Amino acid sequence: NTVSGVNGPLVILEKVKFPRYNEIVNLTLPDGTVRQGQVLEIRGDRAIVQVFEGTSGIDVKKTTVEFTGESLRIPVSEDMLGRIFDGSGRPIDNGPKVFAEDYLDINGSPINPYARIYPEEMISTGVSAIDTMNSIARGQKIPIFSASGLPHNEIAAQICRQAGLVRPTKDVHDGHEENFSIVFAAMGVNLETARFFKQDFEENGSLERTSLFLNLANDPTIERIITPRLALTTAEYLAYQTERHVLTILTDMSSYADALREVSAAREEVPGRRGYPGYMYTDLSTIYERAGRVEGRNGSITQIPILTMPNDDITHPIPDLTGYITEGQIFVDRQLHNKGIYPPINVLPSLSRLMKSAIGEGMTRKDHGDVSNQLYAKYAIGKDAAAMKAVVGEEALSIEDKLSLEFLEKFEKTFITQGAYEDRTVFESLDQAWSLLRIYPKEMLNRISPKILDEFY
């Protein structure tokens, strides 16, 4: 009906009891622009709305509302690739709107025809330190944990450029046979970097294959959270109807987390630990839900969320909850970056717990899981030996440890390091693993069965 009040950016409507839940309402403001808002909650003879464009202009008696009568749903086309959108899917280049062939729900709770077949075939991201150690399977969602003090935007970028150049490597491996498409969603990221993302798609020649949703921080909070839901829904349509391998790259979760946090400052719903909502978990889980093998089991959606730790620790609420919903984690680190390493990836807390089962010898090798296991134990000792080395002197060193100190550096500067443009064969990756291990006797090995070792070493 009309504004009773506005409390924070949240706008308090006084209105008669009829609307749908998540029903779009259009607020008529006196300035030549009408705007849409969604009822966040519906209550007894009032509804609290956060208006999707702007944050100012609402008046007491100079406002009018009319109920659209329809809750927000994303209008989906599979012709949506090769178009530039914003966070509401409106054009910024004038002309390419989302348009439709079907209308599907933004939550993806109605359809949810996610297959009960567990991640199957191999995926790589062309970065050796990712591929071998925490090996990606289709439908597997494994987070990229980063920290600021980093060119973390450059690491995300690298993965976006690399995605789709990997795919002929994968065809040959027989972990892909079908088209590859990219769904790209941006939330609260710098101007320069938004041009880097467009440019990386352009180079690849996959601009046609990708959709860009661009959302800045000067576009509202509620609208920020909707953006990946639009993207996600379109990916689900790609994966289900046309049996495609869909990669959605969703950056930046941190920006998404803040937005959730700013709200509930006038809701009846109350915020829990560290001022984060307690149903923050619930919010993450809605995003995360569209990910997994689709029914038809020739398509899948693989999802890579990008998280920068804003405080740097991994026990901060943003990473801690995410790591739990996902199956393992991938750690980027400040320390490698300082020495002058790119892409700087620490592997010591990095483990994916569903890695072994997915992969098999037919597109990897049987030693892929064994050779990875050896390299973690040796790297771990090398790291403790280093810390002790500083404090006491070379008094606590032993033969294995001196060897381990060299191993650390060897691995760091040959294995993990590679150019932005560079991409890597998995089979190649595995010969370079063996090479590093060749400086240790075989009697000191034990995370590999003696049968397996004898064949490939």
Partner: protein, 45 residues
């Protein structure tokens, strides 16, 4: 910068590592210098 949410547990054990080292290493040091002194008088003669 170090983790804020329940670092306490690891950081306490760091202290216990350190502490054990002062006592033990001081016993070890004490004993070596006690011997050293004995040798000193022998060598001089």
């Amino acid at each position: 910068v170090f983790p804020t949410r329940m670092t306490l547990g690891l950081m306490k054990t760091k202290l216990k590592g350190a502490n054990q080292g002062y006592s033990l290493l001081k016993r070890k040091s004490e004993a070596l210098t006690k011997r050293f002194r004995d040798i000193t008088k022998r060598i001089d003669d």
